[PDB]
From a paper:
Interestingly, the crystal structure of A53_2 has a monomer in the asymmetric unit and the dimer is formed through a crystallographic twofold axis in space group P43212, as observed in the structures of several other PTEs: A53_5, C23_2, C23_3, C23_4, C23_5, C23M_1 and C23M_2. Indeed, in the [name] variants studied, OP hydrolysis products could only be observed in the active site when co-crystallization was the method adopted, and only in crystals obtained from AS and glycerol in space group P43212. The electron density in the active sites of the A53_5, C23_3 and C23M_2 structures co-crystallized with methylphosphonic acid clearly indicated that the ligand replaced the six-membered ring present in the apo structures (X3B in A53_2 and X3T in C23M_1), and two of the three O atoms of the OPs are in close contact with the two Zn2+ ions at similar interatomic distances of 1.9–2.0 Å. However, in the case of the three crystal structures of methylphosphonic acid (A53-5, C23-3 and C23M-2) the same methyl group is oriented in a different direction, into a space defined by His57, Ile106, Trp131, Asp301 and Leu303. Only when the [name] variants and the OPs are co-crystallized from AS with glycerol in space group P43212 can the OP ligands displace the cyclic compounds X3B or X3T that were initially observed in the apo structures. Thus, electron density corresponding to methylphosphonate was observed in the active sites of the three [name] variants A53, C23 and C23M.
The enzyme phospho­triesterase ([name]) is capable of hydrolyzing such OP compounds. Accordingly, it has been characterized from a number of bacterial sources, including [name] (Bd; formerly Pseudomonas diminuta), Flavobacterium spp. and Agrobacterium radiobacter. The present study focuses on Bd_[name], a dimeric metallohydrolase that has a (β/α)8 TIM-barrel fold with two Zn2+ ions embedded in the active site. Carbon dioxide reacts with the side chain of Lys169 to form a carbamate functional group within the active site, which serves as a bridging ligand to the α-Zn2+ and β-Zn2+ ions, both of which are required for full catalytic activity. The buried α-Zn2+ ion is ligated to the protein via direct interactions with His55, His57 and Asp301, and the exposed β-Zn2+ ion interacts with His201 and His230.
Author numbering:
A (entry chain A), B (entry chain A): 34 to 361
């Protein structure tokens, strides 16, 4: 209630500080890093790259990241703890399910899924004792029958524990509207939910319809852009053709509409990425060499020059994540 | 070449003895047993159930099982080693990919997949040092583009190492024909391939077309039957409405056609099964309380009473698996 669970234990709300609410140490699949570490060069190479990136983010002012990798995104909390220890950056781990649940998850009931999410929040992840501080869910268009169960189980786990929910959307398909409907049918407060990848769309009617009913809006992929890589079909499909400035200006748009307290900003960066095409991490790193430091080093000064007060940006990067993550 | 790799190290061909060539300790998904052991009651309960079942199989004459669980079927070779040690039954582990590859596998090239399979055969699975003795692959109808890559990578790994390939089919769709075509396009000898779940069909033209060109025929689900459970839709979809006697008589049919040296027989049993509906293991155990001992306790005497000589059944259960598994 007055503590947020991290991969190194509980921290006070004050300790979280500048917080990136949607990040990944490694976007993978369950068991994959253990079974095929050479895909990333080596496990040690992945750790070192992550520690260097988090250290640079910490020098730019970041104090906490929320790693929203789930079980099926290959979340390895022992890896997160090692990297968090070495970089002196808090890492909040996630439960929930992302875009790639295996059969052993896809065949489960809403009650079974709730047990699993509660296990990772209340007891621990695997045998590590590390407890999730957030629940991650996903749709990519209209929800599959199973995804409806996942969203309902996430609501039930959140209602039992006060831990918030954050989502993956196909933003241009307005997924947040169906996600909101399911969450609200289970009695979940919108104040406990971040509708993520919302910077993937320019539709202000969709974004303000979510914000008006109390949802937090995840503008979490600001440096994702393939402008300058139209040659590259896979990178264009993943990153889009909208500039980082266009994405960042949605932060100002929601501020100007009165929603500054409901905005959560992040990079959605990673240090390894096996769940997409080979060498995508190299392509992404050439687009954005600042990595997770892109928000404080480039987005914050950009919004300042566009006239957003520093106090407003401090509220967005410090106050909003603390209010969101604090169990309630 | 003169050794078969098991989860406890290499064994001589003579040590394999009576061998069940298609079995599972636990049909699951990667990482699932680690993340949610309570699904199986407990990890300790799963181990104990498996040790009891293997001990009963050993008392019935079984000396070796081939666990054809892949990475994506949740193969845990440390679990296999513990159960193999406690029951004094050799267990051969598998590499390859089954019906549920995650994104981090599905996006890989044929070259990358070959590296992964070779890793598990030549170096070891995860950090355990345990090496696979067989490569498992799967189609369920016409092969997906990715499944074509898996089959080709399996052929390449087999050609480099001499380790055999065994397959999952939708037998009534005659999957073995396309599997054979892809394998042969890569230069793989049919003598290194078992076309599995072949007892799911009664089509003798399909079965003899595979056997005639040299494939081994996996009659591996003999006790799978939902006769007596027409009420149960999920069990009927999984197990089928053909009797175990009907499946077992395919063994005699292929013997009578001259293929006794190409028949491999098994139960396709499991001690846990999270990749299907909840409580399926209870349903399956009520259908077949003998578990993995069903082949020696019921199928062998049944074929004897139908006139198959004991020497022929000994060739099928001892000689054929040794010839198949011996790297060449
Ligand atoms: Zn996402
Ligand atoms: Zn993400
Ligand atoms: Zn199968
Ligand atoms: Zn099987």
């Amino acid at each position: 209630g007055d503590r947020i669970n991290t991969v190194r234990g509980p921290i006070t709300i004050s300790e979280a500080g500048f917080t990136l609410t949607h990040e990944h140490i490694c976007g993978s699949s369950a068991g994959f890093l253990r079974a095929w570490p050479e895909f990333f060069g080596s496990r040690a190479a992945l750790v070192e790259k992550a520690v260097r990136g988090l250290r640079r983010a910490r020098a730019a002012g970041v104090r906490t990241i929320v790693d929203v990798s789930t079980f099926d995104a290959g979340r390895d909390v022992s890896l997160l703890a090692e990297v968090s220890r070495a970089a002196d950056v808090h890492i909040v781990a996630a439960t929930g399910l992302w875009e790639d649940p295996p059969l052993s998850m896809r065949l489960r009931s809403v009650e079974e899924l709730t047990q699993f999410f509660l296990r990772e929040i209340q007891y621990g992840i695997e045998d590590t004792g590390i407890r999730a501080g957030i629940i991650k869910v996903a749709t990519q268009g209209k929800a599959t029958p199973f995804q409806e169960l996942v969203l309902r189980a996430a609501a039930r786990a959140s209602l039992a524990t006060g831990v918030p929910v954050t989502t993956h959307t196909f933003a241009s398909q307005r997924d947040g509207e169906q996600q909101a409907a399911i969450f609200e049918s289970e009695g979940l407060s919108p104040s406990r939910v971040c509708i993520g990848h919302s910077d993937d769309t320019d539709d202000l009617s969709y974004l303000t319809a979510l914000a008006a009913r109390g949802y937090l809006i995840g503008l979490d992929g600001i440096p994702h852009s393939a402008i300058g890589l139209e040659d590259n079909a896979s990178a264009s499909a993943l990153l889009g053709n909208r500039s980082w400035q266009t994405r960042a200006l949605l932060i100002k748009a929601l501020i100007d509409q009165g929603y500054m307290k409901q905005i959560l900003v992040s990079n959605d960066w990673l240090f390894g990425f096996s769940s997409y095409v080979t060498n995508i991490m190299d392509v992404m790193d050439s687009v954005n060499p600042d990595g997770m430091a892109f928000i404080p080093l480039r987005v914050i000064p950009f919004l300042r020059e566009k006239g957003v007060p520093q106090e407003t940006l401090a509220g967005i990067t410090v106050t909003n994540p603390a209010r969101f993550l604090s169990p309630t």
